[PDB]
Design a protein around this ligand. Structure first.
Ligand SMILES: [Zn+2]
Ligand SMILES: [Zn+2]
Lengths: 114, 222, 537, 100, 92
RNA sequence: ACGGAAGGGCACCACCAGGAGUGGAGCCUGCGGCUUAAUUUGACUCAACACGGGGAAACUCACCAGGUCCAGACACAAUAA
RNA sequence: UUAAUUGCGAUAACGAACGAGACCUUAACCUACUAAAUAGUGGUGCUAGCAUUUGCUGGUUAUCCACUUCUUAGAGGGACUAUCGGUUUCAAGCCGAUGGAAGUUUGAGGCAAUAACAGGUCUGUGAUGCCCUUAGACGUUCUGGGCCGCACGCGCGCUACACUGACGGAGCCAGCGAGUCUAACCUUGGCCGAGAGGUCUUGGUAAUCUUGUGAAACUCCGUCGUGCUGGGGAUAGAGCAUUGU
C-alpha cells in the first residue's frame, strides 16, 4: 500500500504475516500490517519476499517438530491432566449411552447360561 | 447514531424496566433494588436480595435463565450481559426489604398493631434514628381508616430528608380490599460513610483546653 | 479458562433436611497484575539457521543448524535492540544457547568488554565455566575468570576477563564497593538464571542487586541491559513492571509445552505417621514404580534429608533381592573392569551399593566419590541416582524418572517440619526427560492426601514469584545507602519504590502482612513503617 | 493519531474524578493535549400537572435532569490508548473514543 | 387454534434449547422476533400451556416473559422425541 | 367540637392610594338548558366551568345506526381419520 | 418584635423535640485558581475599498502566535443587614446615611409537622373488594355519524373602539428550548411562483447546521385626518395551495 507507518510490533498486538513471518537477515517478525505497507524489511532494508534432498537436510527435518511443537501447544488442553489413582475414568465418551441399561442385560444372561 | 439527550434518558428508561422486572419476579426473595454497571464490550447487572440462593437457583439455573430472559428481549449480543447475586447488608435498615415483612405478615393473618410494632422495634434495634409505619385501608371494618406508628424522631422537610430517609410503598391485596404500607427509615448521619455526618442545623463546640498562667518568663534553647 | 460469573460457597447440614446455609461470592478486583499474560505460539515457521547471523567466527562454531522455535518471539530481538527482555525456558531448553545471546547482543558493537554472568548457586558457577571455557575462549580469544567465595583471582585478570560468573552473594560484595570499585564501570548487559528464587534465602540478595542497576541506569542516564532466565512465572506483569523490560522481546510459556513431554503422577499417603513410619509404607511403591515406569531407562530419586539417603538405599537394595537379578542394571559385563571400578569406592554405604546398579549421593562423601556416582551414570552403568534436593541445581542429569520421595522438610526456625515450596519441585520436574534419548518424561509426586488436593490444583499452574526481603531488610538496606547517597528520610520511600517489593506490596498486601487497608495509600505508611521499623533497630 | 475521548455522564462529582485521573496520567506520560473543554450543561425539563385527575387547583411541577459533557483531546501511539480505555471505569459514566 | 401444527413444532423446539421466550402484547403485528410465524399464534400457544403447571408468565409492562419448569421441559421432550439428558435449556 | 358571643392578630387569593381590567360589542372556548339516535361522560362557592394536561374528521371514543371476529385458558362427557 | 410560639421580656418554670428557619436548585460579583479552534479576543500573514501620511471598515481555516476581559464551565471566596447615627425595659429589633455586585427573610422557587374532608379520580394503571356482561357479549374489530348540533343563561379569554393612532418604506436588538438510523426531524442556499407553496443539493444525533432563531411592541422618514374614516375586521362569495387514506 506504500504506507510509511513502520509497524514494529513484531506480531505482539497484530497477527503475523503468514506468507512472510520473519526476516531472513535480522530476524524481525513482520505482522500483517507490516506486510502489505512495504515489501522491504523495516530494520535492515533487506528483501522480505523474493520477486527433499535438494533442500538442506536439517531445515526440512527442523520443521517436523515445530509442527509438533505447535501441535503440542494446540493440543495442550488434555496435556495438563493429572493421572492420579482416584479418578473414575468412566469409560464413557460423553454420556451414559442414552441412560439405558440393556447392553449389560447380557451379563446376567451369561450368568443364566452359566 | 443516537442523540445524547435521548441516549441518557434511554438508560433511565432502561433502568426503569429492570426495577419493575425484578420486583415482579424476585419479590418473594426480598428484592432490594438493582444496580446497572456498564463496561466496554460487556455490561453487568448486580441483583441484591436476602435469599440469594433462591435467586441463584441450583447451579445458578435461575441466574442463567434470567440473563437469557433479559438477553432475548433487550436485544444484546451474546455474552454482553452477566448477572451477579450478592447478600444485601444491613437488612434491618432497608426500606424495600423491611416493607416486605409487612406484606408477608399481613397476608398470613397477623394483627395490625403487633405487626407494625414488630417492625418499629426491629428497625430501632438495627441502630436507626427513627422509623415510621403507615397502614391504610379497610381494617376490620366497613369504613376505611389509617393507623400510624412512630418511634424516635424524624425530619420532614428539606434536603436532609432526601438523604437520611428512605421510603418504601407496597400494596397488599387481601380478599377484602387493597392495603397501603408506608415505611420511612432515618439512618444515622454519623454512620453515613458518605456525604454529611450530621444535620445542617446542628453545631459542635470543642471543649477549651485549660492551662495555668505561666506567671514567669522562661527561655528554652537548643 | 471461562471466567465464572461468581464463586459459590455451599454449607449443608448432614442430618437435617432443609438446613441450608450458602453464600455467593463475587469478584470485581481483577486488576492488570492479577492476570496471567502468557504467550500463544504463532506461525513463524521459517527460522534463521546459523548462516543468517553474519559472523564467520560464530558460524564456524555451534554446529547447531536447527534454530530453536522455542525462541520464536525472541529470535533476534535481543540480537540488535538494546532494551531489556525476559526469557524463561525450563530444563535444558536454552540454558546453553540463549546464554550466548550476550555476545550476539552488543559485544560485536563494542568488543573486549567484561559482561558478567550471575549464577544463584556455586554449582551453576562450575558448569557455566567448564563447558564454555573450551567453547568461547578458543575462538573468540576471551578468557573466563571465576569470582566466587572460594576463588579470589588477581584483579588484573578480572579486569581483563570477558566472561565473569559470580554468585549474587559474592556479586553483592563487589557491588557493595560500586562507588570506588573501578573494575565495575563497563557493565552493559547482565545475564541471570533462575530468576524466580526471590523467595529463597539468596533472593533478597538477588533482588537487591537488580534494583541497584535501576538507580545506576537512572542516575547515569544510560541503560544497563538486563537478562534473566527462569521457569514459568505467574506474575509476569510485575516481572515486566520491575525489570524495566520493553514490549518487544519476552518469553514465558507454561509447563505444558516443553521440548520433551512430562507426565506427573500424584500419590497421597496417610496423615497419621509423623515422619518416621512414613517411609516403610511408600518405599515399596517407589521400587515397583521404577520397574513400572522405567523398564530399561534411567531413573532418579530425591530423598528428603541426609539420613533418608541411606535408608532408601538399604530398603531398595533389600527389595531388589526378591527378584531375578540381584545386581540388576549394573551394566558392567567385564568382571575385571568391575573390580577396577569398585577399587576406587572408599567406604560405607557406597561400597556395598554400587554393585546393585543403584547410585547414592549426599553431602557427606569425598569429592571424587560424587563424580564416580555420576560418571557411571554418564555411561548409564547405574540407573538409580538417589540424592538429596541439593542436586536439583547442579549438573544436568539425563534421567527419565523423578520420584518426589515424601513431602514437608524440617525447619529449625519453627522446630518442626514445614511443607515444600513450589520453586524446588517445579525445577525438580525438569530433571525428568532425557534429550534425544526418549520421547516423554515421567515423574511422581509422592505426598500426603491433605496436600494432594492442593498440589493437584497448582502443580501444573504454579504460584507467582514473591519477595521476602523484609526479614533481613536491615542487612541489605545499607548495601547501596551507607555510601552517603541519601541523608533524609523522605527519599527513603523512593529508595524501595524501584524494588520488586513495592510492586508486590500494593498488589499483594495480605502476603506482606498488610491487613488494614488494601488501597495504595494504605500501603504507603506500612511501607514507611517498614522503613521506620528498620531505623530504630 | 490525535485520538479523542468524550465524557457525557450525568453526575458531576464522578466526572471530575474521571477527568482528574485522565489528565494526571497524560502529564506523567508526557503527552501533548488540550485541557478538558467543559461543554455547557443542558437541562432537560418536563412540566406536568401534579394531579392525575382533573380536579383541584392547577399546580404544575417541572422535573429536571442535568447532562454534563467533558471531552479531552490526546495525541499518543496506540499502546497508551488501549490501556487508558481499559482503566478509569466508573458507574454512570460512558466514554466513547474516536480517532481523527 | 385452527392452524397447521408444524408451526407449533418449531416454536416448541425453539422454547426447548434456551428455555426462555418473550413476546410483545401487540396483537396482529404479523411478525415475532426470530420466529417465522406471527405473534397471536405464538403468544396464545403458551398460556394454553401454562395451565398445567408447565411454564410461567410475567406481565411486567405487557411484555409476557415466559420460563419453563423441570417437568415441563421433560413433557416437551416426548413432543420432540429425543433421548433424555441430551440438551437442556440450562445445561452445564 | 360547635355557637345567628366578645376581644387580639394577620392577608393585594381583604381593604387602603392607585394601575390594569372583567362585566358593555364581535369572535374563540367550557358548562347548564333545548334538540336529537347519540349530541358519551366526571367535576357545581372559594376548593367545577381553555379543568380531566379533553386544540375529538378516521383511531383516541367512553355515545348512536349498522357488519364481522372470539383470543371461552383448562378439566369432564359428547362427534369423530 | 418578626414573614414566622421569629425572638426579647414579666414570670412556677427550666431544658428540649417536630413545623418555620436551617437545607437544596437557580439569578446576580470575581480582569483571582484551573482551563478551553464546538467560545471568544488581540497580533502576525494573504487579500478588497476609501485615504493615501503612520489609519478605518472588511473577508480568509491549515497562514501562524499569545491570553482567557466578555463566553462555557469545575473548585472557591464574598453578605453576617457591615460601619456610623437615631428610637426602644435603651433587649429583640425598626429607620436614615456611608461603603457595597448584592442590605424589601439578597430575588425566586423545591421540600414542607399533628390532624381533618365521608373533597376529586374505579375514564391512568396487568392496582383494586363486590355487583353486572361474557359469544346475535357492555370484549375486540371494520363502515358512517356524534362529541362542533341552537329561541337562550353564565365562566376564563382573543380582537378592538383610534392620532400616545392606522398605513407604506427604511433603522434593527434578545432569551428559554428543540431537532433524522434504519428514519425520513430541524433546514440553510440556488431556481420558480404575488402569496401560500414546490423543486435539487447542503449542514446537523448538535456550544460547532437550522440560529446572531435579524420576533414583535419599538426608532426615523413619508400618506391619512376627527368623517363609525385609510378605525374594527364579524358575516359572506369565488379562486389558488398545504397535511392527511
Ligand atoms: Zn503490527
Ligand atoms: Zn531484516
Amino acid at each position: 500500500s506504500g504506507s510509511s507507518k513502520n509497524c514494529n510490533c513484531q506480531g505482539t498486538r497484530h497477527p503475523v504475516f503468514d506468507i512472510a513471518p520473519n526476516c531472513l537477515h535480522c530476524g524481525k517478525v513482520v505482522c500483517v500490517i507490516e506486510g502489505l505497507n512495504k515489501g522491504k524489511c523495516g530494520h535492515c532494508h533487506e528483501q522480505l519476499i523474493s520477486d527433499k534432498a535438494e533442500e538442506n537436510p536439517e531445515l526440512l527435518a527442523a520443521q517436523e517438530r515445530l509442527d509438533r511443537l505447535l501441535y503440542f501447544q494446540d493440543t495442550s488442553a488434555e496435556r495438563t491432566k493429572i493421572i492420579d489413582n482416584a479418578s473414575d475414568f468412566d469409560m464413557n465418551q460423553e454420556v451414559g449411552l442414552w441412560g439405558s441399561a440393556r447392553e449389560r442385560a447380557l451379563a446376567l444372561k451369561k450368568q443364566q447360561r452359566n | 447514531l443516537i442523540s445524547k439527550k435521548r441516549k441518557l434518558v434511554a438508560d433511565g428508561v432502561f433502568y426503569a424496566e429492570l426495577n419493575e422486572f425484578f420486583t415482579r419476579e424476585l419479590a418473594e426473595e426480598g428484592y432490594s433494588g438493582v444496580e446497572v454497571r456498564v463496561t466496554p464490550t460487556k455490561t453487568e447487572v448486580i441483583i441484591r436480595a436476602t435469599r440469594t440462593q433462591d435467586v441463584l437457583g441450583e447451579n445458578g439455573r435461575r441466574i442463567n435463565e434470567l440473563t437469557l430472559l433479559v438477553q432475548k428481549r433487550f436485544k444484546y449480543a451474546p455474552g454482553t450481559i452477566v448477572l451477579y447475586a450478592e447478600r444485601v447488608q444491613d437488612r434491618g435498615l432497608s426500606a424495600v426489604a423491611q416493607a416486605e415483612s409487612m406484606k408477608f405478615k399481613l397476608l398470613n393473618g397477623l394483627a395490625i398493631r403487633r405487626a407494625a410494632y414488630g417492625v418499629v422495634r426491629y428497625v430501632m434495634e438495627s441502630g436507626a434514628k427513627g422509623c415510621e409505619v403507615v397502614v391504610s385501608g379497610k381494617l376490620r371494618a366497613a369504613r376505611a381508616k389509617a393507623m400510624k406508628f412512630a418511634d424516635g424522631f424524624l425530619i420532614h422537610s428539606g434536603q436532609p430528608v432526601n438523604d437520611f430517609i428512605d421510603t418504601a410503598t407496597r400494596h397488599v391485596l387481601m380478599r377484602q380490599g387493597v392495603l397501603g404500607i408506608k415505611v420511612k427509615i432515618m439512618r444515622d448521619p454519623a454512620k453515613s460513610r458518605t456525604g454529611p455526618k450530621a444535620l445542617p442545623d446542628a453545631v459542635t463546640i470543642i471543649e477549651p483546653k485549660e492551662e495555668e498562667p505561666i506567671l514567669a518568663p522562661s527561655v528554652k534553647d537548643y | 479458562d471461562p471466567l465464572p460469573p461468581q464463586v459459590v460457597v455451599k454449607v449443608v447440614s448432614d442430618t437435617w433436611i432443609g438446613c441450608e446455609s450458602t453464600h455467593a461470592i463475587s469478584f470485581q478486583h481483577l486488576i492488570r497484575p492479577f492476570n496471567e499474560t502468557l504467550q500463544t505460539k504463532l506461525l513463524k515457521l521459517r527460522p534463521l539457521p546459523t548462516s543468517a547471523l553474519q559472523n564467520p567466527l560464530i558460524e564456524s562454531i555451534y554446529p547447531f543448524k536447527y534454530f530453536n522455535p522455542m525462541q520464536t518471539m525472541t529470535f533476534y530481538t535481543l540480537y540488535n535492540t538494546n532494551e531489556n527482555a525476559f526469557v524463561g525456558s525450563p530444563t535444558g531448553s536454552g540454558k546453553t544457547i540463549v546464554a550466548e545471546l550476550a555476545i550476539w547482543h552488543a559485544f560485536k558493537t563494542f568488543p573486549g568488554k567484561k559482561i558478567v554472568y550471575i549464577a544463584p548457586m556455586k554449582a551453576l558457577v562450575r558448569e557455566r565455566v567448564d563447558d564454555w571455557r573450551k567453547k568461547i575462549t578458543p575462538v573468540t580469544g576471551d578468557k573466563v575468570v571465576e569470582l566466587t567465595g572460594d576463588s579470589l583471582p588477581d584483579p588484573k585478570d578480572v579486569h581483563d576477563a570477558t566472561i565473569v560468573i559470580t554468585t549474587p552473594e559474592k556479586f553483592d560484595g563487589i557491588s557493595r564497593n560500586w562507588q570506588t570499585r573501578k573494575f565495575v564501570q563497563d557493565v552493559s548487559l547482565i545475564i541471570m538464571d533462575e530468576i524466580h528464587l526471590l523467595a529463597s534465602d539468596r533472593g533478597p540478595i538477588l533482588e537487591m542487586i537488580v534494583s541497584r542497576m535501576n538507580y545506576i541506569s537512572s542516575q547515569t542516564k544510560q541503560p544497563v541491559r538486563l537478562l534473566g532466565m527462569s521457569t514459568a512465572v505467574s506474575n509476569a506483569y510485575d516481572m515486566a513492571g520491575w525489570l524495566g523490560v520493553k514490549d518487544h522481546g519476552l518469553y514465558n510459556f507454561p509447563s505444558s509445552v516443553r521440548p520433551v513431554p512430562l507426565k506427573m503422577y500424584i500419590d497421597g499417603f496417610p496423615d497419621n505417621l509423623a515422619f518416621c513410619p512414613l517411609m516403610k509404607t511408600m518405599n515399596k511403591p517407589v521400587f515397583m514404580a521404577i520397574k513400572q515406569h522405567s523398564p530399561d531407562k534411567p531413573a532418579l530419586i530425591f530423598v528428603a534429608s541426609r539420613r533418608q539417603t541411606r535408608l532408601t538405599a538399604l530398603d531398595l537394595i533389600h527389595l531388589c533381592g526378591m527378584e531375578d537379578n540381584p545386581r540388576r542394571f549394573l551394566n558392567i559385563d567385564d568382571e575385571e573392569e568391575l573390580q577396577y571400578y569398585l577399587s576406587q569406592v572408599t567406604d560405607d554405604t557406597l561400597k556395598l551399593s554400587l554393585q546393585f546398579g543403584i547410585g547414592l549421593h549426599h553431602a557427606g562423601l569425598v569429592q571424587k566419590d560424587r563424580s564416580i556416582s555420576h560418571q557411571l551414570f554418564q555411561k548409564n552403568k547405574i540407573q538409580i541416582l538417589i540424592a538429596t534436593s541439593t542436586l536439583a541445581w547442579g549438573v544436568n542429569l539425563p534421567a527419565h524418572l523423578v520420584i518426589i520421595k515424601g513431602t514437608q522438610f524440617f525447619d529449625a526456625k519453627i522446630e518442626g517440619y514445614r511443607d515444600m515450596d513450589l520453586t524446588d519441585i517445579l525445577q525438580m520436574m525438569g530433571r525428568a526427560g532425557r534429550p534425544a534419548y526418549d520421547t516423554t518424561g515421567t515423574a511422581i509426586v509422592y505426598t500426603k492426601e491433605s496436600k494432594k488436593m492442593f498440589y493437584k490444583h497448582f502443580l501444573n499452574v504454579g504460584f507467582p514469584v514473591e519477595s521476602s526481603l523484609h526479614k533481613v531488610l536491615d542487612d541489605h538496606l545499607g548495601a547501596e545507602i551507607t555510601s552517603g547517597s541519601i541523608t533524609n528520610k523522605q527519599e527513603a520511600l523512593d529508595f524501595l519504590s524501584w524494588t520488586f517489593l513495592f510492586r508486590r506490596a500494593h498488589h499483594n498486601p495480605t502476603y506482606y502482612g498488610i491487613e488494614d487497608d488494601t488501597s495504595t495509600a494504605g500501603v504507603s505508611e506500612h511501607l514507611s513503617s517498614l522503613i521506620d521499623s528498620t531505623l530504630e533497630n | 493519531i490525535k485520538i479523542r475521548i468524550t465524557l457525557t455522564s450525568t453526575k458531576v462529582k464522578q466526572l471530575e474524578n474521571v477527568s482528574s485521573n485522565i489528565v494526571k496520567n497524560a502529564e506523567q506520560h508526557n503527552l501533548v493535549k488540550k485541557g478538558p473543554v467543559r461543554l455547557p450543561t443542558k437541562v432537560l425539563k418536563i412540566s406536568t400537572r401534579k394531579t392525575p385527575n382533573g380536579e383541584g387547583s392547577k399546580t404544575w411541577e417541572t422535573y429536571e435532569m442535568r447532562i454534563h459533557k467533558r471531552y479531552i483531546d490526546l495525541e499518543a501511539p496506540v499502546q497508551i490508548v488501549k490501556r487508558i480505555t481499559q482503566i478509569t471505569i466508573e458507574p454512570g459514566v460512558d466514554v466513547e473514543v474516536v480517532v481523527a | 387454534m385452527l392452524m397447521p401444527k408444524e408451526d407449533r413444532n418449531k416454536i416448541h423446539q425453539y422454547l426447548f434449547q434456551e428455555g426462555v421466550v418473550v413476546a410483545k402484547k401487540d396483537f396482529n403485528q404479523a411478525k415475532h422476533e426470530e420466529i417465522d410465524t406471527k405473534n397471536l399464534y405464538v403468544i396464545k400457544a403458551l398460556q394454553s400451556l401454562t395451565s398445567k403447571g408447565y411454564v410461567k408468565t410475567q406481565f411486567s409492562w405487557q411484555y409476557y416473559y415466559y420460563t419453563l419448569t423441570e417437568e415441563g421441559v421433560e413433557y416437551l421432550r416426548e413432543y420432540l422425541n429425543l433421548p433424555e439428558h441430551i440438551v437442556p435449556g440450562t445445561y452445564i
